[PDB]
From a paper:
Laccases (benzenediol:oxygen oxidoreductases) are copper-containing enzymes that catalyze the oxidation of diverse compounds by molecular oxygen. The active center of laccases contains four copper ions: A blue (Cu1) mononuclear copper center (T1) and a trinuclear copper cluster (T2/T3); the latter consists of the mononuclear T2 copper ion (Cu2) and two T3 copper ions (Cu3α and Cu3β). T1 acts as a center for the reception of electrons from the reducing substrate, while the TNC serves as a binding site for the molecular oxygen and its reduction to water. Three-domain (3D) laccases are monomers consisting of three cupredoxin-type domains. two-domain (2D) laccases consist of two domains and exist as homotrimer, with the T2/T3 located at the interface of domain 2 and domain 1 of neighboring molecules, and T1 located near the surface of domain 2.
Author numbering:
A (entry chain B): 41 to 321
B (entry chain C): 41 to 317
C (entry chain A): 40 to 320
The structure:
Amino acid sequence: GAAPAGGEVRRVTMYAERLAGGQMGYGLEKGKASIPGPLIELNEGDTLHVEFENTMDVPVSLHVHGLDYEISSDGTKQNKSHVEPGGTRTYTWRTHEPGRRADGTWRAGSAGYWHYHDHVVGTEFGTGGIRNGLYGPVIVRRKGDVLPDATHTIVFNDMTINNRPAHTGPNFEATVGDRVEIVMITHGEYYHTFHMHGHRWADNRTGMLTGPDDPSQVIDNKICGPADSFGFQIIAGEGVGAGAWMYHCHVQSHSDMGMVGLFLVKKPDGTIPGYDPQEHA
Amino acid sequence: GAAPAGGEVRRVTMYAERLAGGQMGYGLEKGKASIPGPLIELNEGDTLHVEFENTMDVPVSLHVHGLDYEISSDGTKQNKSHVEPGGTRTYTWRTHEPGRRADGTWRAGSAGYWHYHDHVVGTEFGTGGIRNGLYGPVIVRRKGDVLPDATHTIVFNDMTINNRPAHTGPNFEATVGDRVEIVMITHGEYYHTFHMHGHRWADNRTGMLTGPDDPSQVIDNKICGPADSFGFQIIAGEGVGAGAWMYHCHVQSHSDMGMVGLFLVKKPDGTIPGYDP
Amino acid sequence: AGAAPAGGEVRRVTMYAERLAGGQMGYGLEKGKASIPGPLIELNEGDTLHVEFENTMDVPVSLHVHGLDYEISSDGTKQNKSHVEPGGTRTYTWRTHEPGRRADGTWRAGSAGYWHYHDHVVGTEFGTGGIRNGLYGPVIVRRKGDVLPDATHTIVFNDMTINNRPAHTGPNFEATVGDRVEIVMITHGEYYHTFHMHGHRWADNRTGMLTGPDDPSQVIDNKICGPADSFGFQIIAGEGVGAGAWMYHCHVQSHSDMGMVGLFLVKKPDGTIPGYDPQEH
Ligand SMILES: [O-][O-]
Ligand SMILES: [Cu+2]
Ligand SMILES: [Cu+2]
Ligand SMILES: [Cu+2]
Ligand SMILES: [Cu+2]
Ligand SMILES: [Cu+2]
Ligand SMILES: [Cu+2]
Ligand SMILES: [Cu+2]
Ligand SMILES: [Cu+2]
Ligand SMILES: [Cu+2]
Ligand SMILES: [Cu+2]
Ligand SMILES: [Cu+2]
Ligand SMILES: [Cu+2]
């Protein structure tokens, strides 16, 4: 697979729901909200109309990074694009291809790893919403972008991964050789440094080197702060083989307190070498 | 609207002065000091002799990032290039173009988004003088760089933008279609994440991709730490139209405590849709 | 002087973990010669390194590496039972690969870059104790044709110290104007830092050096960094600025104020640094 040229006009329904544990989630269907919210994938040029409904007892909003949107889809109290309790609103996101402007410069596409989150709960910056779990990924693909066997979203939200209690992963499974895509988002108050054992990627738009003349740095550790978003694709177990490969924040008290999960890379027979589930507790 | 080749020897007078309620700033003429300090632009290859005068009762200095300067223009007490009270000094900053060295490798030029600040007030690293307002931006352009319709300078200085009180901006104005340049400098103790609503830029030298071969990440949110500086040009309203477009620090307590302003992009008739002055 | 050659050799080294004075711990290649930072390990892409490792201490220790290819048995984590018991021995194997075109048409990133190793088991199962105590070291993987330097120096921001040195005690590095000097910068611990050098700059890419006039990497003199970040650059000492006691420091204001400063002592050909008086520093 490779992404095709874009330009489809899409629609979807989206709800903001209270979840258990005092949380809040987005979902595509009533009663199916998740944390992180649902992954929205677009190709450059597609438009997405989001038929949005607020099912909670407090205003909420939908603010997106990186995608074209007019002020009316800003998703803020400050230009009256929030959604009252029980209210509804259609947010529109647009994307565009890159190309030469008439002044000679190059307009950058919308392609990239982006995200969306609340901007209204708690404060007019969505501090309460984001803490509760109102966030999710948006991938915009360029025509020709290689496509992954799977996509996993890792959000460092304050001292949590995906709002989970400490040392509860999440874990992610792949088989040696799968092309795995990772979307990494950070939210909240703290900086973090995302690290993956056994695996590395290029610090560019795709996480993959364009070819032999890409000078981007190849890393396995990146500092990130609130609302940063990047992603990459790795071949699971490439050059290293199967195993329970940790990913964690490398800030030493963060990993000690539980900002750790496993990238479980399995042999073809589905087993994991030297993976004693209880030696990782 | 493109930068020319440099090589001109330029001179400017700068002054350090005190300002109201504890603050201090640089000025091009006395009485006229500002926080941030004056924007300095140069073309790669230019030399700049800053004829500097400290009008304050305490020592001060002028230290610059990225530009060429000999150790005597270090702007540090450590190297004895600070400026005593009432004193004067001439700091020389030079720039160069990119080109191939003798050893055959490529030497990077001076072009970039840079800044200058005090290095001796409060501490030997400027801690009290940076806190007080003693910082400013420097742009060095390469030959061929497209020139903006405006440049606006945003300094995250601890928990403030441009040492301004919380929730007071600043706001900048443009018209849809304007090529707008933002200079972003961070100072103090805190990390930040700069975010702009409705607009995006490439994470490279200019903030614009070189072309279809430029693999630089395109972003709208950037982590920055003390003495980081970067800049970019955007077409205002490009693909998103007019309106009051927020920029802020995206650390949640920071934006909550007031690290937020507006990029007011106006329709050619001058009105901003949706905006509530 | 010159270029990195093509890799492919299988190298062996003995490495030791040893107690050092002051409650510190260090790696070394020979007994009694442990250092903080540990020894610089240098490989070319394709090289294999069998580290014959010995733990001379009374507590468990491990060797974990960033960026290189290792199988999960050389993870160096208690979690995967690749730590070394007090008095114990273990051969860690690190591999590197050249970049190249995969059968799927994408470009495989090579191992080349500025990497580091460190402990993963001392104090906590994320090595928080052994990293505090000085168990960390640089690794450089060179791509064929990489420019070699006249000298390489390693600067590790470890918590609020540089190379575990007392406040304001450097270290200092000396070069002559025109020397090609390689800096390897690693960060560790709990804190974010910004690395700054007076009178010098580099490219934010793999080598630190612009590949040519087509390379768009930002050129910087100041770089935010977090725990386990590792980058490097080569500069021409004093190029366009002359001899001098050029400070490098973390630019987080209170960090420099309280010790995170050192000196790049760049000398004229006659050995002099005019104006340099250590008592003013
Ligand atoms: O506000 O993101
Ligand atoms: Cu916002
Ligand atoms: Cu963290
Ligand atoms: Cu690791
Ligand atoms: Cu945001
Ligand atoms: Cu901030
Ligand atoms: Cu936003
Ligand atoms: Cu500075
Ligand atoms: Cu680890
Ligand atoms: Cu620091
Ligand atoms: Cu400096
Ligand atoms: Cu300095
Ligand atoms: Cu590590």
